[PDB]
Design a protein around this ligand. Structure first.
Ligand code: QTH
Ligand code: QTH
Ligand code: QTH
Ligand code: QTH
Lengths: 354, 354
């Protein structure tokens, strides 16, 4: 039960005391409870709570999550979080201030990578993603994020000056593919691949999926999608394909490079069909009433869409990871991860015949 | 039908094209319609619309309001607006970006000052305010805004160096009252005056109240409260008292000083009772089920609360207006308005025996 720095205890006390109603408003500092959930220099997380000896007066929460930003994107993330809260699709928003926010505390654990392929879990992930994809949001609907971001990252990658010989070497190999050519060939392929533009999560991986406490044996509604920091209007195919890619990566590996990759854990076509069979009726209400025939066509075309867009997930994250090898302060094998993503890019390309 | 500057037409076109769905996404610039609703250097307003010859594809609006900011408060105002939109208490939010936002266009006119005293109108204002006062919001609940703001303004007022002799003269008269003494005597009075802390509009005047098109002959639900720029947790008494004060001021007067003030248009006790008789059942659901006796006590105590807090409305706006005489760029008799507010402050004080 890790205690925060005294400075952070006092600030957390004041934010809770001033932003939360009822018993919080009169709470003594010496009866304030706080423990560190995630440390670091940015995006730090703390649990704050009333003493067990203090009764609630109304509907105020007894326990909350404090998120600290630490080390216009802020306007947009805050507005998004507030709207998702109002719509019961994310944790409630209790307080917002320059340094962070107070959010609803949701008893839960994160999923592990192996759990993504469980048929019931996968079905519910698909339903939750489809629900998210139906959200009308006050943000730019031109789907510029995907290629805008890859172009931005590639610009950065070509200008990196590594000093470490192992990274110099790995970078030269990755750039030997002619990444500008490959990106513009990918742009050509996806231009010819229909995919509706919807509000996408953009990071649907096990670490962003809560298994809700007390719901673990429930048939449905045991999950919640969280961490919408990178959510935007984007091609639907990307959100689904990106999720499929995440079946292959275990970030809990406790030896350098601090991930495991397995190409054979990508969902099989059978598994992919199971996922999209749950997605579609959740996204298009009367989908079930279509003939078995029309449903089959729509499913086949979606399989093609999502597996092509999976290529963009590899390329995007490969580029992202090279930049992180230059700019990150976390211990992680970023260059080896980049190579894993580009390996999967070319393996997938070959399987698609593209 | 005033057209905007070409620069603004092009930016408005792009914001509408990129943030609004359906027919907007493919709209040609030469079929984009825009007209200026309010000009100026800040908070400019434009109406944007589809051509009549373009059909809607889905549920997209045919007409919207563009608000431009022009010349962390922004995070908070945006989050507030988004939440009020979600809760159906304000116009929908269609787009948010650094320079402004796209809002729902609400066919309507503003009320005139004379209309505030109409019994049906006043009853509905009271119901809408009570509804607003029930809103739980993610903002600081310590009621520091009222006196914090008056102290801030008074600091500014004491440091103003006017160059215009008529303003030098008017300022000397207003400061001759010993405003620090008077403010701290007001703080003492209000400290002893119970008033619940609720989410307040803080500017409930006729210019911020829409009379909804086609609802003018409807028994109820003909109004909408707008312009929450200054909304905050605050003493309930202030929101109601401030509204009552606004019965006395007509800002449509077309000769200098560009307002009329009439002390005799403050609501009579009968009118005040009519207002609070609508407020209470809208704020406290089972209020009607109380005995005539308990209801009468609660009403009497509220009359006292609100008329004491009305003094703060005078003092706050008096101070505010002196600062505006120094810093504003609008033609308005700010010093004469300040004197009108302090005149009403002392007149009200004398009637209260305080
Ligand atoms: C070891 C431990 C944690 C991390 C890590 C920490 C935080 C994040 C946050 N993040 C999530 C999604 C991101 N995206 C980049 C564009 C697509 C989505 C970028 C960054 C990603 C990875 C990396 C290595
Ligand atoms: C590429 C490389 C690594 C990862 C990744 C690695 C680890 C994790 C789990 N995780 C561990 C630590 C995290 N943080 C530590 C402090 C900042 C946030 C956030 C997330 C999630 C994602 C994602 C993409
Ligand atoms: C002539 C025409 C318009 C105006 C005017 C224009 C905009 C506003 C906006 N405003 C609304 C409320 C304000 N408050 C100050 C603290 C209480 C609420 C301050 C400013 C107020 C007055 C003043 C003179
Ligand atoms: C003290 C003094 C004047 C007023 C007041 C005066 C006029 C109005 C009506 N009004 C007229 C013009 C307004 N604007 C013009 C460009 C910026 C906003 C806004 C509001 C509303 C309030 C309010 C308080």
């Amino acid at each position: 039960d890790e205690q925060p720095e005294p400075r952070t205890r006092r600030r957390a006390y004041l934010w809770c005391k001033e932003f939360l109603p009822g018993a919080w408003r009169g709470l003594r500092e010496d009866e304030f409870h706080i423990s560190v959930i995630r440390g670091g220099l940015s995006n730090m997380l703390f649990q704050c709570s009333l003493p067990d000896t203090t009764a609630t007066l109304g509907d105020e929460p007894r326990k909350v999550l404090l998120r600290l930003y630490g080390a216009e994107a802020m306007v947009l993330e805050s507005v998004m979080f507030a709207i998702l809260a109002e719509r019961s699709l994310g944790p409630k928003l209790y307080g917002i201030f320059p340094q962070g926010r107070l959010e609803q505390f949701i008893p839960s654990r994160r999923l592990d990578t192996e759990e993504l392929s469980l048929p019931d879990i996968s079905a519910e992930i698909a339903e939750k993603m489809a629900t998210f994809h139906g959200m009308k949001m006050p943000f730019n609907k031109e789907p510029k994020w995907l290629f805008g971001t890859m172009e931005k990252y590639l610009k950065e990658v070509l200008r990196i000056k590594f000093t470490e010989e192992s990274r110099i070497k790995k970078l030269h190999k990755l750039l030997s593919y002619n990444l500008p050519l490959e990106l513009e060939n990918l742009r050509s392929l996806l231009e010819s691949t229909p995919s509706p533009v919807v509000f996408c999560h953009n990071d649907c991986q096990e670490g962003n999926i809560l298994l809700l406490e007390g719901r673990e044996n429930s048939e449905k509604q045991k999950l919640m999608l969280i961490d919408f920091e990178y959510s935007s209007y984007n091609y639907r195919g990307f959100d689904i394909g990106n999720h499929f890619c995440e079946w292959m990566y275990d970030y809990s590996y406790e030896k350098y490079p601090f991930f495991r990759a397995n190409i054979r854990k990508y969902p099989t076509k059978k598994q992919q069909l199971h996922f999209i069979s749950s997605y579609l009726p959740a996204f298009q209400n009367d989908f079930e009433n279509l003939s078995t025939e029309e449903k089959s066509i729509i499913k086949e075309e979606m399989l093609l869409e999502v597996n092509r867009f999976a290529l963009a997930s590899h390329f995007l994250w490969g580029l992202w990871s090279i930049v992180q090898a230059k700019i990150s302060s976390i211990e992680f094998g970023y260059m080896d991860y980049a190579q894993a993503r580009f390996d999967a890019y070319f393996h997938q390309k070959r399987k698609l015949g593209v």
